[PDB]
């Protein structure tokens, strides 16, 4: 254990570097580079420097088995590229975690691989580079006072997170990852675990940014706080609409009539059109009058927020008489795969919402699963996460409206496979 | 790069083996070009979460599928934007060489992003992750294509031998404008779009007529969910392969491929259009 001392300055405490400048010894040296089984307990000034300008090429740099713990971060120079930090701890930085400001000749497949990131007060700066966290633990928290640790990417970096845990502690609650410029973040087969007071998204994309979910277990039953003053309650944050998952399933089930507590993993994995009353009229859907009276239906502007539409279905019951079906049907249906169905809605009729799935013929092929939307005068996100059926062609969205004298506003209606 | 002198490192799959390459870079220097790998007989390339680099004039494919062989790609960075040069003289500029159609492909992106006015700088995945049918008059018809008259006269189609290489179709549409009065829309609709994922489009084509070549998504309902792609196909007398990379729009149900041909008394040659999810 390497603790620095209250007089130490400067800006840095350790800078990895290479004096052989020579091609050929490049491969020779580099083999066998090795830093292993230190643990730097810093003061939250100095930083861990790795390359240089004037250095020759730092890579293939095994640091494992070490502790970079209450630093100013780690930084990376000139020519320094496919460093292994193998089981490593990065936790309770000062300022900055990790700073990648695209530095010349540097990059290429950095590693993290087992790595315990966490309680940090600085943010990892992933200005182009390419990063790869395998089996790593982060952030559980921030420090106090002090920055967030957010994975911030931004140029043309990539991130891959795959076989670990993003996990935040109860009480923390601040975005983990941000996806900006023409960045790229991929996760796979890793849980992402969110206290019951979180209530922002973990992840933001922005600009021509992309996020993929892969076999990923994550949090979207229990909580109606999670992505608070978001389009919906989503788990992705951002306006980028490059938005892919594929094999992500709530953490442990879903209580299907308990749509109050559902959360989708992002308004832009959708397939319905027009779900929200922004073409003006309803098309894409059908009003089906089965009481005496005519419910009728219009398109206004009586949104929850405008953040991607500001317009909004409003059914209207004039008498205790009138009832109808207000459907679309979404041809977008894999058997054995979990779909995610969001709406926002401001119910004061009794409204019945419901889903099932057809065949090609339009026979039901398993029970519906319907939602009573409770009465009141404010807009409310309701979303069910649930399994495919076989033989699914088609996806059902019905809302049925009756016997109170009333009206439900319908916005942004949300199906897609997750 | 490669040993001056000596032959290509290429990682070279034969029999029934296997190999997966994840969370790593495939990437040339420049002045480099080779096949990085090769698949055959019953064997199986898995790449997932890596970035592949090529060069200015890289002129080959990095990966070759023959036999029963199978490649699948997994949320890759591809080099899809840029390069006129990639797959020379292969089927069309495609990263996979190779005439087995076991192709996969989910995730992956172009690099750094695509210009989507710049189709004369576009690379495909594969020409196998098709889910057009009769896109290069195969059927000796223009079964799964629809002739719109627009303008005076008549414009019209037909299918004939005029293509850039024999290697997958040996035939291609022809489009006529025989005034400045006519116009018609050459139309193809493809029900495969999963919103936010990324789609290919390609074609060659040797324009002498005004063609604006555009993609547009339609819902069930036959409106179109986002504003159409578009491009004016240059003029000349040479085949050019031309292709766009981009991400299907929310309420996206189906693909629309339209050309427009109008104004110049000409035509167009038009072969192997390909659409599919990557
Ligand atoms: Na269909
Ligand atoms: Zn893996």
Same mark, same amino acid.
């Given at each position: ?24 010894? @490049? ?18 000034? @100095? ?27 780690? *930084? ?8 292994? %930090? ?33 309680? =940090? ?45 993003? *996990? ?32 922002? +998204? ?8 992309? +996020? ?64 929200? #009353? ?5 098309? =894409? ?5 089965? #009481? ?27 008498? /205790?008489?009138?009832?109808?079906? %207000? ?9 054995? @795969?979990?779909?995610?169905?969001? %709406? ?20 039901? /092929? ?29 996806? *059902?969205?019905? %809302?049925?409206?009756?016997?109170? /004298? ?13």
């Amino acid at each position: 254990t390497l603790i620095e001392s209250a007089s130490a300055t400067g800006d840095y405490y350790l800078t990895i570097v290479n004096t052989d400048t020579d091609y050929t010894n @490049r491969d020779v040296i580099n083999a066998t580079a090795l830093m292993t089984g230190v643990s730097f307990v810093g003061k939250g000034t @100095r930083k861990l420097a790795i390359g240089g300008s004037t250095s020759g090429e730092v890579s293939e740099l095994r640091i494992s088995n070490c502790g970079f713990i209450s630093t100013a971060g780690i *930084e990376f120079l000139d020519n320094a590229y496919r460093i292994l %930090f193998d089981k490593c701890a990065l936790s309770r930085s000062f300022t900055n975690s990790v700073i990648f400001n695209s530095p010349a000749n540097s990059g290429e497949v950095i590693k993290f691989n087992h790595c315990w990131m966490v309680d =940090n007060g600085g943010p990892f700066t992933f200005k182009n580079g390419q990063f790869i966290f395998d089996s790593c633990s982060l952030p559980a928290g921030k420090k106090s006072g002090y920055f967030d640790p957010v994975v911030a990417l931004s140029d043309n970096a990539t991130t891959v997170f795959t076989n670990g845990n993003i *996990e935040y502690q109860p009480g923390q609650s601040f975005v983990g990852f941000t996806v900006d410029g023409s960045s790229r973040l991929s996760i796979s087969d890793s849980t992402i675990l969110l206290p019951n007071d979180y209530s922002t +998204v973990p992840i933001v994309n922005n600009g021509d940014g992309v +996020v993929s979910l892969n076999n990923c277990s994550l949090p979207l039953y229990g909580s109606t706080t999670i992505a608070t003053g978001f389009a919906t309650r989503q788990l992705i944050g951002g306006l980028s609409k490059k938005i892919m998952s594929r094999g992500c399933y709530p953490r442990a089930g879903f209580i299907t009539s308990n749509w109050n507590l559902g959360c989708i993993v992002s308004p832009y994995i959708n397939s319905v059109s027009n779900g929200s #009353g922004q073409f003006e009229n309803i098309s =894409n859907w059908t009003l089906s009058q089965t #009481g005496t009276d005519v419910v009728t239906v219009t398109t206004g502007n009586d949104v929850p927020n405008d953040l991607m539409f500001s317009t909004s279905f409003v059914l209207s019951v004039p008498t /205790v008489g009138a009832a109808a079906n %207000f459907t679309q049907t979404i041809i977008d249906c894999e058997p054995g @795969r979990y779909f995610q169905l969001g %709406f926002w809605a401001k119910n004061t009729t009794t409204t019945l919402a419901s889903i099932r799935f057809l065949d090609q013929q339009g026979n039901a /092929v398993a029970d519906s699963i319907g939602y009573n939307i409770p009465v009141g005068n404010t807009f409310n996100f309701y979303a069910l996460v649930d399994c495919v059926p076989p033989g699914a062609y088609r996806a *059902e969205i019905n %809302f049925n409206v009756s016997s109170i /004298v009333g009206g439900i506003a319908i916005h942004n209606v949300i199906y897609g496979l997750i």
